[PDB]
Amino acid sequence: MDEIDLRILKILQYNAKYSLDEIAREIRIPKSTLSYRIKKLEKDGVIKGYYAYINPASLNLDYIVITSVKAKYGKNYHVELGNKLAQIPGVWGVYFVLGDNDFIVMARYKTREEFMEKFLERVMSIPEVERASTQVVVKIIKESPNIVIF
Amino acid sequence: MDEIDLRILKILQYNAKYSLDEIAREIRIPKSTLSYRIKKLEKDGVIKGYYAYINPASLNLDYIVITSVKAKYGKNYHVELGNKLAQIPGVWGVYFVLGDNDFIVMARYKTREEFMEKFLERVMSIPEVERASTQVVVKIIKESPNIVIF
Amino acid sequence: MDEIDLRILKILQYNAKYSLDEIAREIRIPKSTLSYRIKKLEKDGVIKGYYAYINPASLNLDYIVITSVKAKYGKNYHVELGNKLAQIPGVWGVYFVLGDNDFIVMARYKTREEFMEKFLERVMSIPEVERASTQVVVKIIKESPNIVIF
Amino acid sequence: MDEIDLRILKILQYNAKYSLDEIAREIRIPKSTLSYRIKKLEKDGVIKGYYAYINPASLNLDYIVITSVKAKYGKNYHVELGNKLAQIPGVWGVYFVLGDNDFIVMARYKTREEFMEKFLERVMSIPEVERASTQVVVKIIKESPNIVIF
Amino acid sequence: MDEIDLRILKILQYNAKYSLDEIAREIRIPKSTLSYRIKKLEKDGVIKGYYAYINPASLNLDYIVITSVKAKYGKNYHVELGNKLAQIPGVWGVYFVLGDNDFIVMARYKTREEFMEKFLERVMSIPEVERASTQVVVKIIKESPNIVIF
Amino acid sequence: MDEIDLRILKILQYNAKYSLDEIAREIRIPKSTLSYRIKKLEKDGVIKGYYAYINPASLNLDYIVITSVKAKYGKNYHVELGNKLAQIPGVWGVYFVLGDNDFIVMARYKTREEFMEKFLERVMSIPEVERASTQVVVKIIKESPNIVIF
Amino acid sequence: MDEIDLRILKILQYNAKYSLDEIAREIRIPKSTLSYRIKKLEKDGVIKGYYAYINPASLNLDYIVITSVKAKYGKNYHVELGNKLAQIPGVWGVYFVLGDNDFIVMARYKTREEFMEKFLERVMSIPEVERASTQVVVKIIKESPNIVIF
Amino acid sequence: MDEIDLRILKILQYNAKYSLDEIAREIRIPKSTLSYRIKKLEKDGVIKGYYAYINPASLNLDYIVITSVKAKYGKNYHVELGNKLAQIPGVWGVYFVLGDNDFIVMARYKTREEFMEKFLERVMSIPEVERASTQVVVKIIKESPNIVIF
Ligand SMILES: NC(=O)CC[C@H](N)C(=O)O
Ligand SMILES: NC(=O)CC[C@H](N)C(=O)O
Ligand SMILES: NC(=O)CC[C@H](N)C(=O)O
Ligand SMILES: NC(=O)CC[C@H](N)C(=O)O
Ligand SMILES: NC(=O)CC[C@H](N)C(=O)O
Ligand SMILES: NC(=O)CC[C@H](N)C(=O)O
Ligand SMILES: NC(=O)CC[C@H](N)C(=O)O
Ligand SMILES: NC(=O)CC[C@H](N)C(=O)O
Ligand SMILES: [Mg+2]
Ligand SMILES: [Mg+2]
Ligand SMILES: [Mg+2]
Ligand SMILES: [Mg+2]
Ligand code: NA
Ligand code: NA
Ligand code: NA
Ligand code: NA
Ligand code: NA
């Protein structure tokens, strides 16, 4: 990757539906090359794919939660718990972090009932779970994970 | 939105680079209509846009952090603090949550130094901040915010 | 339910011992209809019943407590613990809440001894209990659960 | 108050809509006396009033919260904060408790938006507030404050 | 007990080595009666005994600790743990309290080594102990348990 | 102090109302000497005094509390707060401890009302107080501060 | 040890590569004696050895951590856990402390990966571990353990 | 630095008082070269110096503490507090860490009194300090900061 690739990426991270001509015109390079570079980035694994950004509200996803989960120590409980949490429907993020040395789980549901049935009841039944604390998100100030180049 | 739109969205959320023919063939509808429905979803605000999914590692984003920030009470400190946190370079997520009644801030940096200079030093200088606790992410078990339809 | 029912309910929630004439005169409708509406609300389940509001002090209920109880994870411990807590004499409120992801238990006793014997000793013997923290209420600033329409 | 009054109260706390004949027949005393005793209890302040028990769901009160609020020390901040919390629409319970030496506030709202506008925004603007932690109630196992005699 | 007994007690709690004449002269009553009242208080259990107040420093008791101990729930673990803590040499106070719903243990030792061997090692070996937190006392602002009448 | 003084003290700490003959007979020394040693211990400050042990229940001291108080940093707030806490009627113990780096305050009152008026209201009005947490003692397993020699 | 030894030590703790002449000249004593005193201190165990102070950065030790580890109670779990933590490669400090009544573990690694593989995975597999909380060091303001004489 | 330098350093970190012949014989290289390499490491800053390892007990350093200090937010309070803590006599370690987002301070004193006068009183007077929590070290399982190569 070179400074040119970064300029290309800084555009595709925002709008992947731009025309090669408009892009090639903004970055100042042969539209034929731009196409090559983009294809190269895809193969090299820089660009993993293209996604449609769907508005969660449009899907009635009104019950947004961020849950900290502590796992019991020993055997391979920690790793096992992480993968179980990642396969729960509605869960889009699972991170293991230092400090609280636990898992931070991001999920979205349409309502409290759905959250209870699909997420909480499932989590409460996992023996390896030492403690879980769910924080209800009441305001999304910002959520642009797609922006990696500031 | 109808059951057909959901089927279309369940595809575009994963791969927006599919061909209309392959999509129209999977859902079983006139490629001409599919195109109309997709265009409608865009105008109605369901599909807000299309983004390229860039691998953070490819950008050397190795210092990933999740920080809880508590704001001092009174005046309009809470709302002000939220917007200040959202404009910090590297910060892609800001949520106000109940429980700890604070802000959960998601950010990514290439190194500790960059994190300190761009994020921490900035946060430590904000007077409205009562307390901040940063959790270093050492393992991303899952991060697929694009998946809204399970 | 219509705006008229709400006006009726806003009265019955405060004083269910009012005369139909005084009520019918305040809301401005045929006393015969008012009676019908009230009867309808009862059948439809809006009005579940009528209770006498007894002053706790009159019963020497001087030891008022609010206890947070955390349940151990696994099997069906959480649900089981909730129902056990609800059947303890003196306990009038049991809620499962997010944040501390535990149970908040409201109870009233005449003295510390009664609290110990009927509530605490019972709770300390429940194996599914991970931790319990009792907060002694020393001042009831307000307690009007009957007011649902402000 | 005597053992007879307690038997009367144990009935009125459950159903104040019983007939004097049915009550007088259950307790075994002159319906004329029962009426006197009940009237006496009202004047002596034992029976403060009669209320209609309205089902919160019937009013779409789906966002139920229990919030702990800590007040800053000094002057008369504590007492002032307590009364401010009690006058917030939707708040039916306010207790000052030992342990966390703070206020436990019970409130009900129809939705998150209403909760934010009427309760949280109001609380976040109170300078005397040191910290507030809201626990979202996701399950009401039991809520019978009217039962004072077990 | 009458106002006269309280005046007598308010003296004996401070200095039990006073002369009956000086006491009888301060309270204004027949030295013969004073003696009777004091004897009565002893039998009735008001005055449980007379102790010599020894200066802890004189005994090289330099390692003073206050430890909170949480017991595991179930069976009769709580009560058992309390009595075990009370029989540890050096422990003069054991209280079960609400809030942290645990035991507060007061002890005194000459040094850290003695504290470790006699108190901590013993406590760490008790299975019923869920958690223990020792606070080292570095300054005794006041310690007059003998004063019960202010 | 020698081994003989310790034997004398081990007796006086339990019962200072023993007869010199019984003591001299138990320790095996001239009653005349025993008297000298005891007098020496008093002057040297080992024995600070003799107190009557009064049963708190006999004084209706039913509301027993242990409160942790955190002081604000700066100036001489810490030292000042300590002395203010020690002069509150009902407070018999005040210790500054490490760990929570705060004050542990022991007090006794006859009732909740008295506790509120004499202790809590006073503490809540002290500006230097950052936070206070009161633990209600519901069971005194052991309280023998007089025993310094085990 | 005398005041002269302290002066010698105050030098050797900073720079053990000084010449006997320069040292003997600064302290004002026969270089032959200085040599004797130093040899005596070594045998008496005051000076345990001489070490080269290596700059951690020079070894790419960029992931510095301080971890609190709580051990389960009973048997000899506490002591066993302490020694296991001390034998983990990268761990240079292990202390058992009061307050949190746990272990504080100091370690250094070149990267997050190394930290995970050598330290965290190892710690997460220890059954005796109740909880562990790792604090990532982002700035070493001072680290001069060699200075014992200020 | 090469594999040879590491072998040299792995020796000097343990015993810098070895003879060049013994070292040159263990690593298998010209004693003349070894000397050059060591001199190079010193200039390049790898070896910052040589220190005498003094046994803290030999200096009566019996009161060992690890203190967490939280700084108030705003201005440049954080950085200022860090340097103030580093200049306190007895303090050998100061680290700013993530998680608790505060300072971890390592210090050693001969007694509690010295700790109070030199460390605690000083820290309690710093206005920028929000909270400080001192953990008394009662057992040093391991303290070998000099070992950087395992
Ligand atoms: N479109 C451009 O910017 C240049 C055109 C380029 N030569 C091509 O092959 O398309
Ligand atoms: N491609 C299809 O699935 C149908 C073709 C459609 N009639 C069109 O207008 O393209
Ligand atoms: N009481 C009223 O307000 C109107 C009387 C009504 N017509 C009835 O049937 O009783
Ligand atoms: N109803 C009863 O139980 C007795 C009647 C009673 N004598 C009256 O005055 O009504
Ligand atoms: N000593 C007094 O105060 C009065 C004496 C009292 N009459 C007695 O019997 O000793
Ligand atoms: N009472 C004793 O034990 C010995 C008596 C002692 N000789 C005295 O002077 O009293
Ligand atoms: N070097 C000195 O300071 C004095 C020399 C000393 N007489 C010796 O034996 O070396
Ligand atoms: N001492 C050795 O290992 C080799 C000696 C080396 N030739 C020197 O110059 O000292
Ligand atoms: Mg996307
Ligand atoms: Mg009622
Ligand atoms: Mg005494
Ligand atoms: Mg060294
Ligand atoms: Na969190
Ligand atoms: Na993991
Ligand atoms: Na939302
Ligand atoms: Na907000
Ligand atoms: Na990562």
Ligand code: NA
């Ligand atoms: Na609570």
Ligand code: NA
């Ligand atoms: Na439940």
Ligand code: NA
């Ligand atoms: Na009350």
Ligand code: NA
């Ligand atoms: Na109050």
Ligand code: NA
């Ligand atoms: Na509900």
Ligand code: NA
């Ligand atoms: Na405590």
Ligand code: NA
């Ligand atoms: Na008990």
Ligand code: NA
């Ligand atoms: Na002391």
Ligand code: NA
């Ligand atoms: Na002090």
Ligand code: NA
């Ligand atoms: Na008691």
Ligand code: NA
């Ligand atoms: Na710590």
Ligand code: NA
């Ligand atoms: Na140990």
Ligand code: NA
């Ligand atoms: Na560093």
Ligand code: NA
């Ligand atoms: Na800093």
Ligand code: NA
């Ligand atoms: Na030590």
